[PDB]
Structure formats: structure tokens, C-alpha cells
Design a protein around this ligand. Structure first.
Ligand SMILES: CC(=O)N[C@H]1[C@@H](OP(=O)(O)OP(=O)(O)OC[C@H]2O[C@@H](n3ccc(=O)[nH]c3=O)[C@H](O)[C@@H]2O)O[C@H](CO)[C@@H](O)[C@@H]1O
Ligand SMILES: [Mg+2]
Length: 473
């Protein structure tokens, strides 16, 4: 621990004198708290240098590293399903939920997982995913003929701001049927916010700097610091499924995805769907021709010309169309070996710059700006992809209508709203029912309860039966 004076000196030597503009006029407790806040920032001069640093030839992945659920035979998919249900039934599968984002585009005070897309069940994203988990645990247990149901640890990464309401939500709901010990919360770190030029850290208040979650890429360090990686080893976990909280269709702990990784012996794998259109705000999974490594090019950093390139083999398609749906597979053995490397260098987790309108101290009191006035920093979870060996990387293309419908925007937008989430969810439910001989009245849509079906299976009993709009099956 450094003394109050030492923390101050270090920030001054890093040229952050603006941070102490009003220091002397603060009470002693405000000064002590400010210093406490400042001391969590490891090596400021470096960080400010690293931020300075922050301020192309791609092609499609080789066929050898790709596979698609829309092409594989029922037997292969069934075999992967079994490989995954076995891993699950043996207590080898854990799930990592990234829920540290603020979801600004959604305009809501509560954490996004608490969001209710108004399905007939009124169930939140969090509840939907928890029943998804209970369900696959049962499917795994049936498959293995176990007496006891396997447990799938659900590690939920929250941010300082989303933590209390998230944990409280789960407690208030008795964990949605899950064992209280299998839902494990841990906070990711933050990074200071900077001025538009990126050389000065912004003051939120006379005695506090503006800070924000360090991006989903800050998960690796949170994993190590919060003893999560330690827990994986102690519980004998071998497989990890990491996903985004906003996907209302997400197949949590999808046995097919896990079987796919097991079958091929992949250290790392990821899911993609066909890009909606040139402008869809999705990263794209490609092969960097320069180093012959898999990687993702984010939607906010790809050139307009490249996002619109037509495919040389087919004019009607976009050349780069493997949209990233934030569904990753990691082997625990790969994480044990790589996490130490990934968090001790900007090489695999470079900062990403995002201009923002940041409510903060005016250069002299608070104020809500109406044009960008600073930058937030973010590390991206996929920046470690090129560190994997190509033949150890897998890319599974899946069906969007069954696996990806994100909640990104408040109602009113054309895409990725509570309304599109709801419709996609009900359409998938209705299709499963109908696909099983069920009959839904015209203009009717039903909801399938995960307790009844994880993803379409076990719906045979629905044959010949009729349904009305809004029924829950
Ligand atoms: C960096 C990244 O993943 N980009 C992906 C993200 O875009 P996008 O920019 O929309 O990312 P989001 O901001 O919604 O974050 C993705 C996920 O990471 C979480 N999160 C984010 C920031 C943070 O500090 N902590 C944290 O836990 C969010 O809670 C969410 O579960 O989803 C798109 C699919 O919809 C993909 O095509 C993009 O490639
Ligand atoms: Mg292939």
C-alpha cells in the first residue's frame, strides 16, 4: 500500500495534475476516498501511455475450421449432442455469463438480464437462461441414467454498477429453481474515462474520476483475480461456454456446441450466423491473411468498403458474412495455460476507443454533455483469438432463427428490440409446436416453457392438439 502522498506524486508524474485541481478544498474524508479510488489504478503512467498507443488483409476461414448445424446430418449432430450431455452429466461443464454491460442503447435502469420482453410468461432474460440450464441438466441426467441431476456452475460476471441489483434479483427469485451454490457472481474491473484527446483522465466529481467496466475482454483478469479460474480447477471443470446476456434465444451449455469442441479436440471455438445485412452491428469472424490466424473484426472498426464487399464466388452474398454471436467455447486447460499471457500484455487485449457523452465535471461543475466529450476504454473478449493455433480453433455456424436474437435497442428501432426478441422467441416456439403436429389458431403464437423443451425435443405429445394465442406449453 502506498501513502496518500505517493499516489498523488505518481499521478502528477503521469501529468494528471487536473485530477487535483480541487483537492485542497475537499474535506479529509473526501480526499482519503479519492486517493483510495486512485490507488486501484495500477501503473497510471503506463496506462496513460497504453491509451496513447490506442489513439488489413482478411479472407474467409479455411473450410477445415468451419462446420454448420444447417448442413450436418442428424446423426452427427446427435452424436455431438451426446458427447456434450455426457460431459455435462460428468460435471465437466461450466457456464460463463457476461453481464457487466450497462446496455445504454436499451435505456433501462436495471441490469439487462432483468429485462422482460413480455413473453406470455413475463420471464426475464435471467430466468429464461436459468430454466434453460435446469432443463439441459435434466436432459444430461436422463441420457446418463443418473440418480442425481448434474450441476452446471453458472459464473455471472457483473460490473460494479450491476452487481447489487443482479444478485438481489436472483435471491428474490430463489435462483429460479437452481441451487444457490451454483450461481456465482464476480465483478469485472474498470478503466478510467479520458478526454477526447485521450491524454487526461476525466473527473466525474471534484473528488472522483469517471470510470467504466473494462469491456468484456476484462473477463480474463476478473477470472484470475476473483478466484474463478481457481474454482474451475477445484471443481474439475474441463469445458466452458461463455455467452452474452442479451440473446433471448441462447442455448446455454448447448451440448452440440460442446460436443463439437470435444469431437474435434478444439482449445477454442465460436458460434456465428449469416450476417443480417451490410450494416448489422456485428463483428465478423475471418482469417487474418497476414498471420494466418483466426480473429474477429468488430463492426465499429471495419471499413465501409470491406463491410460491403461482395463475395467473389457469389455476387448476391457479402464476402465477410460470419457474424459473431458472442458464443464461445474454451477448454479449461487452454485457459490455465493462456490467461497469464493474455493479461500481462496489450498484445492480446488492446484498448478499444469509444467516444461518449460523459456526464462529468465541466472544464467548472457537473453537466450532461450533448456531444461526445470523452472516451471510454474497452478490451474485447475475442482479441485473444489469434493466439490460438488454427487447427485448434472451431467455428460453428448456427441457425439465427433458433439461436440469436439480441436485445440491443429500446422499442422503436427496426432491429434488436424487446419486440423483435419477443417475436423471434414466439416464432421459434410456434415452429417447434407445429413441427410436432400441434395446431395453433390463425394469428396465434405460443410460448414453449424450457421446462418442457430445451430446444424442440420432447414435443411429440403435442400432436393433433390445438392451441390458442398466448398459450404456454
Ligand atoms: C466486444 C464484443 O463482444 N462485441 C460483440 C457484441 O457487440 P456489442 O457492442 O453490441 O456488445 P455489448 O456491448 O452488448 O456487449 C457484449 C456482451 O458483453 C458484456 N459486457 C460488455 C462490456 C463490459 O464491460 N462487460 C461485459 O460483461 C455485455 O453484458 C454483453 O453480454 O455483440 C455482437 C452480437 O450482438 C457481436 O457481433 C460483437 O462482435
Ligand atoms: Mg467446414
Amino acid at each position: 500500500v502506498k501513502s496518500q502522498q505517493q499516489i498523488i506524486d505518481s499521478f502528477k508524474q503521469a501529468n494528471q495534475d487536473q485530477l487535483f485541481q480541487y483537492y485542497d478544498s475537499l474535506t479529509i474524508d473526501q480526499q482519503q476516498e479519492f486517493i483510495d479510488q486512485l490507488s486501484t489504478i495500477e501503473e497510471p503512467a503506463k496506462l496513460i501511455s497504453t491509451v496513447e498507443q490506442a489513439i488489413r488483409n482478411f479472407t474467409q476461414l479455411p473450410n477445415e475450421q468451419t462446420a454448420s448445424t444447417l448442413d450436418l446430418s442428424k446423426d452427427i449432430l446427435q452424436n455431438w449432442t451426446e458427447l456434450g450431455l455426457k460431459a455435462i452429466g460428468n460435471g465437466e461443464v461450466a457456464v460463463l455469463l457476461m453481464a457487466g454491460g450497462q446496455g445504454t442503447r436499451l435505456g433501462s435502469s436495471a441490469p439487462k438480464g432483468c429485462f422482460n420482453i413480455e413473453l406470455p410468461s413475463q420471464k426475464s432474460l435471467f430466468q429464461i437462461q436459468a430454466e434453460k440450464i435446469l432443463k439441459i441438466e435434466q436432459l444430461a441426467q436422463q441420457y446418463l441414467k443418473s440418480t442425481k441431476k448434474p450441476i452446471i456452475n453458472w459464473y455471472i460476471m457483473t460490473s460494479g454498477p450491476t452487481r447489487n441489483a443482479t444478485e438481489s434479483f436472483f435471491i428474490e427469485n430463489n435462483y429460479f429453481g437452481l441451487n444457490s451454490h451454483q450461481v456465482i457472481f464476480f465483478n469485472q474491473g474498470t478503466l478510467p474515462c479520458f478526454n477526447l484527446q485521450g491524454n487526461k483522465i476525466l473527473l466525474e466529481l471534484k473528488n472522483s474520476i469517471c470510470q467504466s467496466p473494462d469491456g468484456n475482454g476484462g473477463l480474463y483478469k476478473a477470472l484470475k483475480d476473483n478466484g474463478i479460474l481457481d474454482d474451475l480447477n477445484s471443481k474439475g471443470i474441463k469445458h466452458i461456454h461463455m455467452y452474452c446476456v442479451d440473446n433471448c434465444l441462447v442455448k446455454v451449455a448447448d451440448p452440440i456446441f460442446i460436443g463439437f469442441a470435444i469431437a474435434k479436440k478444439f482449445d477454442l471455438a465460436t458460434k456465428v450466423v449469416r450476417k443480417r445485412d451490410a450494416n448489422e452491428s456485428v463483428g465478423l469472424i475471418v482469417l487474418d491473411q497476414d498471420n494466418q490466424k483466426p480473429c474477429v473484426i468488430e463492426y465499429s472498426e471495419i471499413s465501409q468498403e470491406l463491410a460491403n464487399k461482395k463475395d467473389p464466388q457469389d455476387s448476391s452474398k457479402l464476402f465477410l458474412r460470419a457474424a459473431n454471436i458472442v458464443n464461445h467455447y474454451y477448454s479449461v486447460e487452454f485457459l490455465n495455460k493462456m490467461i497469464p499471457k493474455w493479461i500481462s500484455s496489450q498484445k492480446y487485449l488492446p484498448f478499444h476507443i469509444a467516444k461518449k457523452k460523459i456526464p462529468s465535471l465541466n472544464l467548472g461543475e457537473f453537466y450532461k454533455p450533448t456531444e461526445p466529450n470523452g472516451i471510454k476504454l474497452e478490451q474485447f473478449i475475442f482479441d485473444v483469438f489469434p493466439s490460438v493455433e488454427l487447427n485448434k480453433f472451431g467455428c460453428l455456424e448456427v441457425d439465427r432463427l433458433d439461436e440469436f436474437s439480441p436485445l440491443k435497442n429500446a422499442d422503436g428501432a427496426k432491429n434488436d428490440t424487446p419486440t423483435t426478441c419477443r417475436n423471434h422467441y414466439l416464432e421459434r416456439s410456434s415452429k417447434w409446436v407445429i413441427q410436432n403436429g400441434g395446431v395453433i389458431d390463425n394469428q396465434g403464437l405460443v410460448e414453449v416453457d424450457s421446462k418442457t423443451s430445451y430446444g424442440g425435443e420432447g414435443l411429440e405429445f403435442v400432436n393433433g392438439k390445438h392451441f390458442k394465442n398466448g398459450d404456454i406449453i
